[PDB]
Amino acid sequence: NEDLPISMENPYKEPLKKCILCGKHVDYKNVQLLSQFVSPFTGCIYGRHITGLCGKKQKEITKAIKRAQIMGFMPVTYKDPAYLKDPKVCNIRYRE
Template identity: 40%
Template sequence: MKDKDRGSVPPPPGGEMAGAFRRARRRGCTYCSDEAQKIDYKDPQSLRYFVTERGKIVPRRISGACAKHQREIQVAVKRARNIALLPFTSN
């Protein structure tokens, strides 16, 4: 490609796709930042955020929770399933 085809902007250093695969910044845990918010197995509406459509518990890298709160979420979801507040699988 000629320079006049690209305009006056030089190509990025390192090639065409230099910054395309940059990792997204990790956001902080929502439960650590908001002390008033608690994980409760009796609240299925808040737990549905951490369960996929197929009924699987969302992993930590997707949920954004820290390790401590991810364990609490996991226990809460399992308890809610056992007392039939959350389904084990999708319908």
């Protein structure tokens, strides 16, 4: 009798995955954070599906990258040699 289905909030929903830098602040002073997303060879900037971000995060990342490259804080043609021991976050494929 009282066992009728009730349309509620629909459970069985886990919290959606957020970005790896959504809870922190992104500035141009941090050279290591903006250089970790740079290929340590051709110096190319990785896209969105490689780093694992969205729209606003990737936009802020590339803005900070361009600002650091123009003002004089990070190379564009390669990666900083002193920041080559950073933990690998992006996915690679070269060199097997």
